[PDB]
Ligand binder design. Sequence first.
Ligand SMILES: Nc1ncnc2c1ncn2[C@@H]1O[C@@H]2COP(=O)(O)O[C@H]3[C@@H](O)[C@H](n4cnc5c(N)ncnc54)O[C@@H]3COP(=O)(O)O[C@H]2[C@H]1O
Length: 125
Amino acid sequence: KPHIAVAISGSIYNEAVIKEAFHIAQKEHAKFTAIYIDVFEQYKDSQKQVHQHLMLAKSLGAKVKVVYSQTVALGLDEWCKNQDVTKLIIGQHIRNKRRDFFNKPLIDHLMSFEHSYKIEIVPIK
Ligand SMILES: Nc1ncnc2c1ncn2[C@@H]1O[C@@H]2COP(=O)(O)O[C@H]3[C@@H](O)[C@H](n4cnc5c(N)ncnc54)O[C@@H]3COP(=O)(O)O[C@H]2[C@H]1O
């Protein structure tokens, strides 16, 4: 039942995460999905990057999905649980100035959510 999802964002780093996610799904003969959580609440004019990253993953054999949610973490966690993801592939958070609650690393919320799927963090090359 191997379902591997790559978590899409508009960061420049996400493209490398897509390619590594492709290698992991291939080397594991897994079903390959790309999930972007659209949240209105910033990163001015990254809608083109997302668009690009989603197409890249489509061109690598992934089914792409867009989910609208209040939060990145809620969207991803609910979506992974409903689609029976077995591993979610995400990029490395790098700390910046904003140390408020919704600028915490995505992984802190998934951990607090007691994620039931594996999570693979891909660092920057
Ligand atoms: N559009 C953007 N432009 C510039 N910088 C951005 C950005 N979106 C996020 N970043 C920041 O840089 C890090 C890049 O994480 P990456 O996208 O490679 O890997 C991301 C991504 O795989 C996933 N993810 C992040 N946002 C997502 C979203 N809206 N929907 C689905 N997956 C998301 O979480 C991983 C770690 O996210 P985290 O927020 O903790 O860390 C993110 C964030 O601190």
